[PDB]
Design a protein that fits this description.
It comes from Homo sapiens (Human). This is Coagulation factor XIIa light chain. This protein is mostly beta strands. The chain has 2 domains: 117 residues, Thrombin, subunit H; 114 residues, Thrombin, subunit H, CATH 2.40.10. Helices cover 6% and strands 32% of the residues. The strands form 2 sheets. Strands 1-2-3-6-5-4 form a 6-stranded antiparallel β-barrel. Strands 7-8-9-12-11-10 form a 6-stranded antiparallel β-barrel. Strand 2 and strand 3 form a beta hairpin. The longest helix has 8 residues. The protein is globular, with a radius of gyration of 17 Å. The chain binds a molecule of 3 linked components (NAG-NAG-NAG).
Length: 231
């Protein structure tokens, strides 16, 4: 029995005329890419929607929340895209409550740390993708894709991605498709060094169609994550 949605952890981030995807990791915390927020957008500007099916559409199970604070990695290189992750702190509603777990909204598990994915480890990426301005009624539904994992040996190679792959990045893709997937968005993969079979291995970074995708390697920042969520 399936009493939980597809990708019920996926968060949508709206401010101004800007948009990023994200990953609910606890009911009060969302994890994204750094570069979505370089410009230092004032927390009170941002809107985050959980449990959303189509981009910028409302829906019964959608929960809209305000963001009370965020932060980017100290070492985030706006040039190289290296420490590309930020945390956002949702705003506890009246009565001290962020993101009411439902079939449509549940956090996603962080990686074991001892998640050592081979290249036949199965992985999935989800998002909305490009949508044309205007005409909210012709939105697009959440989409998904199986991507194979890509060892850094094969990814860091120059016919491929070269010295552009720094520490704390990983790749998944086909060498040879990719318009779904939004900045900030989740890559989730089989783990089995956690009780929960599925874990959050990636955040969508850069990479884009004929060349692999590059992701912040979430285990790598696993301490940064706790150091900053335990608050
Ligand atoms: C579709 O995209 C829009 C961006 O183009 C989103 O816009 C945001 O809507 C919010 C309300 O849903 C705003 O917040 C509210 O602001 C006023 C204060 O002036 C108050 O009335 C509300 O209480 C407050 N919300 C609170 C406290 O929770 C945002 O400021 C607004 N931002 C912009 C730039 O327009 C849509 O929400 C988004 N929707 C969906 C469903 O995807």
């Amino acid at each position: 029995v399936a009493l939980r949605g597809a990708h019920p952890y996926i968060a949508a981030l709206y401010w101004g005329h800007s948009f990023c995807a994200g990953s609910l990791i606890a009911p009060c915390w969302v994890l994204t890419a750094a570069h979505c927020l370089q410009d230092r957008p004032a927390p009170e500007d941002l809107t985050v929607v959980l449990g959303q099916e189509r981009r910028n559409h409302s829906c019964e199970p959608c929960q809209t929340l305000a963001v009370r604070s965020y932060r980017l990695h100290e070492a985030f290189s706006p040039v190289s895209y290296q420490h590309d992750l930020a945390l956002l702190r949702l705003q506890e509603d009246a009565d001290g409550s962020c993101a009411l777990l439902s079939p449509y909204v549940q956090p996603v598990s962080l990686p074991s740390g001892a998640a050592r994915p081979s290249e036949t480890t199965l992985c999935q990426v989800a998002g909305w993708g490009h949508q044309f301005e205007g005409a909210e009624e012709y939105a697009s539904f959440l989409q998904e894709a199986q991507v194979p994992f890509l060892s850094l040996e094969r990814c860091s190679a120059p016919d491929v991605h070269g010295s552009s792959i720094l520490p704390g990045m990983l790749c998944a893709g086909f060498l040879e498709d990719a318009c779904q997937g939004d900045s900030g968005g989740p890559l989730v993969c089989e783990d089995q060094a956690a009780e929960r079979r599925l874990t959050l291995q990636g955040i969508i970074s850069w990479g884009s169609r004929n060349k692999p995708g590059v992701y912040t390697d979430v285990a790598y920042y696993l301490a940064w994550i706790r150091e900053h969520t335990v608050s």
